[PDB]
Amino acid sequence: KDAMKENIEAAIAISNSVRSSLGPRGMDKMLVDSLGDIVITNDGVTILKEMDVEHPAAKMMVEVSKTQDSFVGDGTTTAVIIAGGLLQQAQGLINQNVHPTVISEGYRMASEEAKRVIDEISTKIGADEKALLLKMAQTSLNSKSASVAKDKLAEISYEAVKSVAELRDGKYYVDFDNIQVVKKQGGAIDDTQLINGIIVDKEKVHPGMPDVVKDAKIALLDAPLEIKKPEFDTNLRIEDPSMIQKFLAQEENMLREMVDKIKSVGANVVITQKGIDDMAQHYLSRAGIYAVRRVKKSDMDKLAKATGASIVSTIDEISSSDLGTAERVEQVKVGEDYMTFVTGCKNPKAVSILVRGETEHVVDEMERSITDSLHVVASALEDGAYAAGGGATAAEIAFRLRSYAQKIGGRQQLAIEKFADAIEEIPRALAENAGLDPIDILLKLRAEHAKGNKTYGINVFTGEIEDMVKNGVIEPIRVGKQAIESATEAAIMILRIDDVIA
Amino acid sequence: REQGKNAQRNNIEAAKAIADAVRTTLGPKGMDKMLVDSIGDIIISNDGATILKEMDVEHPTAKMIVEVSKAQDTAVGDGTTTAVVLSGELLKQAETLLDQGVHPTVISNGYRLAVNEARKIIDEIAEKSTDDATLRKIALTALSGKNTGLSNDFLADLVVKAVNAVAEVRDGKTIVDTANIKVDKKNGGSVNDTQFISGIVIDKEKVHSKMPDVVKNAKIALIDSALEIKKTEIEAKVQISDPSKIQDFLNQETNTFKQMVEKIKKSGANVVLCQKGIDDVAQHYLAKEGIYAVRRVKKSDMEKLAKATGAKIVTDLDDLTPSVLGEAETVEERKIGDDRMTFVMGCKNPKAVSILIRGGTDHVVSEVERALNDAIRVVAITKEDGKFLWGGGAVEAELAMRLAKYANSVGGREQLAIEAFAKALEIIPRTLAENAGIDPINTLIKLKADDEKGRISVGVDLDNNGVGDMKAKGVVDPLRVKTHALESAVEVATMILRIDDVI
Amino acid sequence: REQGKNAQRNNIEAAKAIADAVRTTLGPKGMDKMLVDSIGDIIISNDGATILKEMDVEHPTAKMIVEVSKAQDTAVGDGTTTAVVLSGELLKQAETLLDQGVHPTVISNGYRLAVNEARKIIDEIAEKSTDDATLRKIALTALSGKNTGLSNDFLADLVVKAVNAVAEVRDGKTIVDTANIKVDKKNGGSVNDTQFISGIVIDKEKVHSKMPDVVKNAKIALIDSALEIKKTEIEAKVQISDPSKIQDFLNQETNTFKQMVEKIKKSGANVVLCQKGIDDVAQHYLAKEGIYAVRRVKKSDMEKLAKATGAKIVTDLDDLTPSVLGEAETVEERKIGDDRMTFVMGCKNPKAVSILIRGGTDHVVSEVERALNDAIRVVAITKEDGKFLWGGGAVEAELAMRLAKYANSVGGREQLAIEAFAKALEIIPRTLAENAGIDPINTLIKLKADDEKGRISVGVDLDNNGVGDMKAKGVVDPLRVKTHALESAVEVATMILRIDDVI
Amino acid sequence: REQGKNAQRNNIEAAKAIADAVRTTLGPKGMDKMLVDSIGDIIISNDGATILKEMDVEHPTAKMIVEVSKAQDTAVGDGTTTAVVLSGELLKQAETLLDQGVHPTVISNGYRLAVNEARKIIDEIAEKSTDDATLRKIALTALSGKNTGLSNDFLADLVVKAVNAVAEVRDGKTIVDTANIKVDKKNGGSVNDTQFISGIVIDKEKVHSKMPDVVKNAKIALIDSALEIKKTEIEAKVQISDPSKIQDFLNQETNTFKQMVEKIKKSGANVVLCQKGIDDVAQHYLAKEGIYAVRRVKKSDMEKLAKATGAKIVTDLDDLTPSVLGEAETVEERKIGDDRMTFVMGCKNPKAVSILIRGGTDHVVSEVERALNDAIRVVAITKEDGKFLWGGGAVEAELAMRLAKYANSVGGREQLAIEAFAKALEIIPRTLAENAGIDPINTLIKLKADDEKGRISVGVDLDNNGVGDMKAKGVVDPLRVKTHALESAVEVATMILRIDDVI
């Protein structure tokens, strides 16, 4: 009765704090934390992970609705919007004494039928690959503040994914450890570029190291370049003043040797996750080796893949088989900062995107936006099919559930019709957001789909129901399946709970 | 401190309150409870034992009812909610008798007479069968009011399959150690993605990249100690006077790790599962030699693996002989969800299997696992006993009818207590009616008639909207869980009924 | 948390408030702001980036505008105040459109159309010239509203002179690393006392009195490590059993320092610049041998000196060969103000110069340095780009006139946004009018006419009291700073305009 | 106290806030506001004058805008909301000019130039007609956004009917005293139950049961004084020494009341409407004599009745001659709703009518009465002026277009102010768009085109969803209310714009 009334309202509240961010006329959110950190975004996954939800129902709505399985396009915002719809509609049905178990069965079924409608009405990507994917990446950027440069960023998203995509069983596989995305402020959004190689935001460890090394043999380490102290308690016992010299000599010699090993195997560059002793820095420098230290592990993993190096933890046991390869490693100044560009890698399916923005908070959102585009085109390439956006595919599913409901008659049917009304939350949000009339757009939308117009959607620019694929507003088939998947699980979880206790 | 009437009415009131807290979890149409703490946080379950174990019960008398969540013989499936709800009703029905002037001890005697009889009637009416089909019906029933989706028949089958795989026959009797069934979960979505593995699944990745992704015809070494540098017990300090010694000391260490690995190689082991850590240099040489190693393996897994592969858990590597090595056709690492887990398959001992549950949400995979575990227990018990009972309040209805008659064959005061116990049993069929949303009063009226016409298997049917044959619908309850749910309820109700003063 | 209208009107209000905080710093007649903290204390500047970086902004939306102080491409000279003031106006002008019913996104689209056009118009109208005379006009303009006295022409000349000294030509293009121009200050009064040195000036005295005051034909050793007694990494303890040993141990130390100095002498170095400390005994023997040493030299200086003299920064003295030594005609110590600084002149590499600023007050030498640094940047940029723009709001006036027309060639909603962007640009010429104390409204009226008659170079003239030709008065703005000030403003205004809820 | 900018920005902000409070009441699709106090309680109205008169405005500047609710010439219908909303917009649009540097006085001069022009344009474009049909269109329009149900055409007709009944012609001109139209209400449901009575309706019952329910050919006496025992001014005390006197004194009183009634009868009056009380003994003899009496009649009614019947209000009964008696065919009491009211019909003067409103809810009959009263006013004004204007923002759109041109024919500064006044007028058509829920921005775009193509009568049409011809839909506004709404707005905006300091 009440535990439910409350849980449901807490949940719907989350649904509405995200609703206005859906689509081409969607707005962003500014989220300020207790520590004062600020995040301004349109990304529904960031908004949710950010907002401080207290109510346990809200925490669950957030967790389950997260579309966790993948964060492609606006799957999470769409999931959340539908969960709120499904929940709000369940409220009504419960007011009529429909047992929450019927409702959960109905939702479960309608959910299954809906995934089916999508597979059915979907469309395989054909000889149109390049044009389709571009249109997809633009649709995505269209929702973001990155729209401003959607055509250039879309090209970058396409080029990058296409470069790292493996066409295996006649199928495509895209490994993101081949795409390095780095952000640097102090440039316009247009200055964003695709570099064929791996950029690492770090500079040479010592001023005397070279700024460029052609045909680099890269040593990737995971251990620090320092003296090793025994594990058992150890003490030097000096009784002869003369040994004091011999001892310090032995230490410096240990470091000099470590460098000799790395260099003896042909290493040209040394990139470590850990530290490099000041004296070791001297030696590498003197040997003319370009070294960078305290590198990000994620950066290490990407360098290994592109250069074909193996990350070594036992310098002593290092060998040439372990060395990576690249046509050139060079320090370049990107704005204020100095970065290291490893170009012409052994593995050519290795790329980087240098995201620019004038301001910190601008460049942050640009990277968020570009990482979205990459996942959109990559999942479309992988799935092989696409569905029309603009609320077209949702209006269709809604249309096709109202039929199926009458086939699966009974009380289940009420839950199934309610599930259809909920899916219509998408076209409503889109209309509401663009400044159109929901109740008006909805009626026309239903008409077109009844008359078999599968791809008909909401053109928020003209404010007219048109062909979404013709106009290019299309999305990966995956976004819709997951969103309806996450949405129904989130709603069923709250629907089954009749009490909250500590 | 409270004495007499005040102490008793209060205790009864408390018992009833805690029963109410789990009441709605009973049956196919059970609801869930969300339990929230301070740090760890939210738990959503339909499991009565979980709910009570987590609940923050304040009252002493309520802390006593909650103890039923720990009686291993009762706390499986709806056994817990059945015992708690019944204690509540037994105490409630008693209150009336106390009011009339009946002494708490004769009431306790009545309940003892009643429960002993009931325990007899159910062994009398218990249905025999070791039919895999019935086992499946036990699981389907056990998974009924949980948030598992529609995959139940698929899950039920996994259960029977796992159970029949480790079930063994001792002197004429079937014994099933559930500890041989390794159940684990991984957030990947689907549920239908749950797998049945003929081997031990280990949530651990191989320690080093250069180690093989798969080992065939594996001679497995199970190791207790850390493959790290060990310091002596009596304090030791190293004193270097020769600058040259420093290297040597640094080398003795390397050579120490080299030997560790030599010993392992010498035994023929090609896989090393360590319960503890493995130094990076040891990982280096293990990979160099081609041995597949996993570290910091749980003791529980160490033990299951020793069981499945025939390996002896060794602590001192010098006792690492080919005699203590286990065997398995394949040891392979494969990515499940976002993690990489190690699969030990084709073990020397076939009586070991694993169930890798999938389901997404996290908060669902947990209850599903919670579900599959109960299901495994109930199916295992029945596999052993070979007997079961009809569900849906059918058993209680029979009992309520018979004890109502057996009461007449008993003396005055006790008779009253036994008629009270008979009424109390109706709290189960009524709870199922209420939960399904049907009329309690009329379902009971119908249920009574049919069981009196001799229809032993008629329980509460949601579909037929009222009563119906459970035999056809296949709703079956294991025996052991029933008898213990009745017995627990009686023992606890008596403990509480006897208190006349709480200080 | 605030939603919709309340959230937006509020954000706009905030942006406007912070713009007001820097507004009056714009131009030749800019005022200063006194920023006071708790411990360090008072800062007086006209620099907008400094003011904002120091300001204690509370509001999130204001913290966002303040971020422009860090966009290295904008935060030079009036670039910062221009970007902030414009964001404020862009947000203010937007508020009107939001009121009419225009969607924040079409407003954002309008601004994007407008700024892209403007960026085109200015490259079109940009004036080319690498003429040293124009460079001087860039500096004079950059030093305009600062408390530098009348010495500006003298300073401007120093700037061009320094810039042209380190400017180099790569493949056909002039690149100027400002990091080669070492600017430092010393409280001695005068300002006209600022010197241009062909070498590196180091705020460090020679470590020991007996060391030469001047070294000619210097072979300079740059050293990374401390010239002190170094203890081993692995703990070491000395044990003396013979009373005689104590002296020997005390002597090994002396001899250790003696050798350090021997190594240095052996390389031919006669000057030693150490990044760290130098023990007193080492100072003793260095002075004894006639080597001029400085210690605890900043890494920044170590690096500039390695750059200028060709010296390799060495850490292990055993690798101190004549190959790693730098060269300079003279290394002399000379008293500047109250301090004694070391002057390294006639370096192997001519592309390194220093500017020793003087000016007294301390709080003036700081801004003057703050000034000279911006001036150096702007002159450096222009040296590279070879193009510039007319100052005094001339550029904005042209842009405002053109975009006002370009708006017509655009669709309804966007057109509104583009007319709003055109109005926003007038906030610059108006701010200069207001600051100079002249009538804003009439200056704009006049300015518009003249630029429309084709007088591209007419900006706001304090003298003519209204508008006037900047071409004659020589007020010129670098290009790069303009385009980025417009771009920053637009990117940030859009970020803020898009928020409809602050939680 | 606040000075300068702070004082002004603040005043403008205040004005805007109060305008927002009534904004949504504008038009056919206006919303209501619920005003709640402490004791009396809830008021629900769409009337802007009512809302503002009741509102608890704190701010002084807001107390000034609220004063428009009292300007009798403006506060009728939407005149109030139009004046307030426009003042808000005039002050808002001014803020921009103040920002640019325009002096509050030239802005005030611009507005004066603008409003004087506008007042001319509307007399130019005013449509003439005394056509009863147009009168009906005035009322229908006046009753548009009120909670009156669908009975509007029925009400509109009552209005015209009442107006034409009391309308009279002086030297060539039609004068309509609304005070001759007595509007009253009674909670009986229906609304269509509203009656139009040719006489004066009085919410008063006859004082005594035995008095006739109906009097035909009535000679009506209107009396000012109480028909009670009157004590002398100079204190009087009665002293009885003879027990017999007590009766006599008690009788003088009776006889006193008997004479009162004799005087009344002697004049031929057969009805007595007393403004005060009537003693019970007087009621006795009045009923005895067959005179119909009502007491404690409101002075307002006393006056209307003297007007309608030709009766002279008499205070001293001795001056109650047949010359001062009024006439009416029928004086009848009849039950209306739950009350019994007196109906004086067929009065000597035909120029007096009543409207007895019905409607149930109470809180509806009140607004309906509130509505009918405005409607009566507007219809009355137009009846007199003979001219009207097109509704739906048609007038404002024409004005906005013309003044936009007239601005060009004016000098610099003033021109700016006049373009600002022209923009301000668009706040009306935009408010109607917003309220109807249609797109403000596009309706304005369309509206501008059509009025520029010469379509003077095109206003905002809810139906056509955008703009449309008001001529066809019949939405008409009276002239007088328009001109005064513009004038009020300007006078008040100037008062506020001129303040630079609030102490």
Side-chain angles (χ1 to χ4, degrees), chain A residues 306-434:
Chain A
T307 65
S310 299
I311 299 180
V312 169
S313 297
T314 312
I315 290 84
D316 322 279
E317 295 280 319
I318 195 173
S319 66
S320 55
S321 332
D322 302 304
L323 274 38
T325 280
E327 203 284 296
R328 84 109 109 302
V329 171
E330 158 187 41
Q331 180 181 263
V332 328
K333 178 149 74 286
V334 175
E336 192 175 66
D337 303 82
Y338 271 108
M339 303 180 95
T340 140
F341 283 34
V342 44
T343 271
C345 302
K346 200 206 204 73
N347 180 173
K349 309 160 213 69
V351 92
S352 286
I353 295 170
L354 185 41
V355 190
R356 308 309 297 282
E358 292 286 349
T359 280
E360 190 190 310
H361 278 78
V362 164
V363 84
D364 286 352
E365 187 60 353
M366 290 304 124
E367 182 243 273
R368 245 171 257 141
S369 299
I370 300 171
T371 300
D372 235 64
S373 280
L374 288 180
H375 290 264
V376 163
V377 336
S379 69
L381 221 51
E382 291 188 332
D383 299 335
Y386 62 86
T393 177
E396 179 67 10
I397 287 171
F399 176 62
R400 297 170 121 279
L401 281 176
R402 301 250 183 50
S403 278
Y404 176 77
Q406 122 277 94
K407 288 166 197 158
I408 309 281
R411 264 162 149 254
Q412 312 284 78
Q413 178 178 43
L414 257 46
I416 297 177
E417 294 173 349
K418 292 304 165 179
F419 191 103
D421 298 8
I423 286 283
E424 296 190 322
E425 285 308 327
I426 300 311
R428 290 210 168 87
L430 292 175
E432 292 172 2
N433 291 353

Side-chain angles (χ1 to χ4, degrees), chain A residues 2 33 102 255 282 349 383 398 448 469 489:
Chain A
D2 288 287
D33 78 16
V102 187
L255 285 162
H282 170 55
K349 309 160 213 69
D383 299 335
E448 302 299 345
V469 353
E489 273 303 344

Side-chain angles (χ1 to χ4, degrees), chain A residues 20 25-26 28-30 36 38 143 145 236 238 241 251-252 256 282 286 335-336 358-359 361 433, chain C residues 63-64 67 71-73 103 230 233-235 237-239 249 313 316 319 484 491 498 500-501 503:
Chain A
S20 64
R25 288 271 177 298
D28 301 354
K29 308 298 172 189
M30 154 134 73
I38 316 180
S143 214
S145 44
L236 278 43
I238 310 178
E251 294 196 336
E252 290 152 7
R256 167 171 271 116
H282 170 55
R286 258 54 285 165
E336 192 175 66
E358 292 286 349
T359 280
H361 278 78
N433 291 353
Chain C
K63 290 199 262 178
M64 296 315 171
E67 293 203 312
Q72 167 165 283
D73 52 334
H103 198 272
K230 178 187 171 180
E233 269 70 272
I234 298 176
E235 250 227 337
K237 183 168 248 61
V238 180
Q239 300 287 107
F249 276 98
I313 293 171
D316 179 12
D319 307 317
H484 284 303
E491 292 184 13
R498 300 189 74 229
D500 68 335
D501 199 359
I503 313 157

Side-chain angles (χ1 to χ4, degrees), chain A residues 229-247:
Chain A
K229 236 260 189 183
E231 228 100 298
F232 269 68
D233 300 306
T234 304
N235 277 257
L236 278 43
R237 164 190 273 106
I238 310 178
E239 298 167 275
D240 185 345
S242 180
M243 287 298 131
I244 294 161
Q245 271 196 62
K246 297 187 182 172
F247 275 119

